[PDB]
Amino acid sequence: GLVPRGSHMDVEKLRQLYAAGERDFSIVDLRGAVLENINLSGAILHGAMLDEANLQQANLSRADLSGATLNGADLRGANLSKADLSDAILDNAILEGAILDEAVLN
Template sequence: MNADELNRRYAAGERDFSFVNLRGVNLSEVNLQGAIFWGADLSRANLTAANFKQAHLSSANLAGAMLWRADLTQATLHKANLSRSILIKANLSEVDLSEALLVKADLRLAYLTRTKLTKAKLKGADLRYAEVRLVDISGADLSQTILNGANLSEENLLAN
């Protein structure tokens, strides 16, 4: 599927794009609010400034995707692969990233408020200057994560 077809189908009211192959597609600034991409391949896609509010991306492959300034507010990315993705200035507020792979992901200046990172793998991720508030990191792997300048006060990290 290409970007034009996706946009046409979304505009026609279709919301379920489970298992679709959008590998390397340019979807910058696209509005896909509430769409379902369960198990979809969005690896290396350009999703710069895209609107994925309340989208369902569980088990999706977003490895190496460009999500700079993307809005993922209240999205579900349970078990999604975001390894080596660029999430600079992305809005990840109230996002479910439980059991997600964020290995070496670039989360500089990202917004993580009430984000669920339970059992997520953030090994080597870059969270420099990220805004982190009330984030659940229970069982998360934060080894080798870069946290310089991130707002990580004790009351903002919830680990049960």
């Protein structure tokens, strides 16, 4: 039931924790992760590392991604509506087809 930190998180473990009701995935390492199609809506991902992740068609609606790094992440068709992108690094992420409506920016 603990959220693994300080190592690359297993996506299967992420999915199980999320399904168990866990929402706090602050500071997790999901770099290069295959997260295609995943529902992480409402997930706290503050300061998390998602650089280069496959987030194609991911549901990240209302996710707290404040201070998260998403360099080069593949967010094609991803739902970022009402997500918090305060302080996030979206440098070079692909957003074609992504829903940015009401996402929070600075």
